[PDB]
Every structure is written in structure tokens, then in C-alpha cells.
């Protein structure tokens, strides 16, 4: 009210909850990376 969609997932910088930190990691040592431009409208 040039706006663009976020380039990378915001769930990492946004530490919503303590359990979100756990959810942001899993399956051993593989880091979580959503990739470039992971958002859809």
C-alpha cells in the first residue's frame, strides 16, 4: 500500500518457538535448506 517475494525461507531467522529449532533439523547431519525462491502464493 518493487515488492518481491522473500528469496529464502524465513522460518530460520524467525525463531518462533523452542520446538521450531528442533523441527528445523532432522535426519542426522543434513542441514535444512529450502532452496532459492521456495515460496508460492
Amino acid at each position: 500500500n518493487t515488492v518481491s517475494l522473500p528469496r529464502s525461507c524465513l522460518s530460520t531467522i524467525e525463531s518462533e518457538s523452542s520446538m521450531a529449532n528442533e523441527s528445523n533439523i532432522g535426519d542426522e547431519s543434513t542441514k535444512k535448506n529450502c532452496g532459492p525462491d521456495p515460496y508460492i502464493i
Partner: protein, 201 residues
């Protein structure tokens, strides 16, 4: 554990050994439930990991929800969520069979749900399960390090304690109706104490 090699991977195996150390029984989160204040609705989400299924599947790392689809805040319902137990143990070759003057070999085991607290350290145990490999042995990405290999362990599905001399596991036999009849008949004789006494050694 000494004679368990890579050629047995992905195949059902039965190992014997001595438990050396157990782990603390912890709960695992499966399904989470939430309540929405502005709407009066109950939402839920499901979770999974690599060790809950034999066949490989494409990862689906769902995040823990804190907002509604519309932006409303969410409240958690611990009493309506669902949790499952999970334990990890280590098994080692028996000392009555291991090579003398040689270090021993050991293998990990994972137990879930109703097989979670069936043993204690120092027991002689026989475990039947699936010998599996997990993850990628440093193949993904560069990972210049080459020393490490593939992680392996057993998705245990049957556990049996075994009695042995000078061990903390008691011996128990199943009694049949024939056994009960014979023992009850024998009890009625007058010299039973003498017979049993003479039977020893």
C-alpha cells in the same frame, strides 16, 4: 557382533551378546494438536523420521505450527498430542566367547514403543532384527573427509533374555499339565524328602 559384516546389510539377522549400556527412555513426538482462540477450531499436524519405516521415502520436514492459516495465534494441547517411547542400547560379544587378549566388538540397537525397557545392563541377550544403513557416508556435498563410512545399526524387533551361570537373569521353565500331574502325584508319597535329598549330586 564379531562375525557381522557388510555383506549382511539389509538382511534379517539374529545376534547374541551382553548388554553393556542402555539409554534413558524418552518420548517422541508424533502428532501435535493446537487450538485457535479467534475461531474455536482444533488443528493438527503429523511428523515422521527415517527410522520408522523399512523402505526409503522422500523426506517431508514439516515445521512446528505457531500460526493459523489466516494469521491467528495458536495454543498447544499437550493432553491431546501423541507421544511414543524410544530407547537405544549397545550389545557386545559375550566374555565366555570373545577372543582373549583382544578388544571386543559392539553394535547398536534401537527399540521403540512396547520393547522399550525389557532389559538392563549386564544381561545376556538375543536380539533379532534388521541390519540397516542410514544417511549418506559423506557422499553428499564435497565432504573432503573420506575416513568415515555409513552409519549402521539394527532396527530391533525381537528381544530375548538368556540365563547363564553367574548371571543376574533367572531361569524359568514352562509347566505343562503333565508336569503338574506328576509333581502332585509325587508329593503324596511319604519318603519324598528322602528321594529329593538323595537326588542331589
Amino acid at each position: 557382533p564379531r562375525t557381522l559384516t557388510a555383506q549382511h546389510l539389509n538382511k534379517l539377522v539374529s545376534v547374541e551378546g551382553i548388554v553393556t549400556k542402555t539409554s534413558l527412555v524418552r518420548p517422541k513426538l508424533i502428532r501435535s494438536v493446537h487450538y485457535a482462540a479467534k475461531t474455536g477450531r482444533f488443528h493438527y499436524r503429523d511428523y515422521t523420521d527415517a527410522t520408522t519405516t523399512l523402505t526409503t521415502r522422500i523426506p517431508t520436514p514439516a515445521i512446528y505450527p505457531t500460526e493459523d492459516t489466516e494469521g491467528n495465534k495458536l495454543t498447544t494441547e499437550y493432553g491431546y498430542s501423541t507421544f511414543i517411547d524410544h530407547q537405544r542400547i549397545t550389545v557386545q560379544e559375550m566374555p565366555e566367547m570373545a577372543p582373549a587378549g583382544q578388544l571386543p566388538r559392539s553394535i547398536d540397537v534401537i527399540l521403540d514403543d512396547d520393547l522399550v525397557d525389557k532389559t538392563k545392563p549386564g544381561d545376556r541377550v538375543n536380539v533379532v532384527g534388521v541390519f540397516k544403513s542410514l544417511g549418506a557416508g559423506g557422499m553428499n556435498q564435497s565432504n573432503s573427509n573420506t575416513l568415515i563410512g555409513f552409519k549402521t545399526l539394527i532396527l530391533g524387533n525381537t528381544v530375548y533374555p538368556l540365563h547363564a551361570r553367574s548371571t543376574g537373569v533367572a531361569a524359568r521353565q514352562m509347566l505343562t499339565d503333565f508336569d503338574i500331574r506328576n509333581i502332585n502325584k509325587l508329593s503324596k508319597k511319604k519318603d519324598i524328602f528322602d528321594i529329593l535329598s538323595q537326588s542331589l549330586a
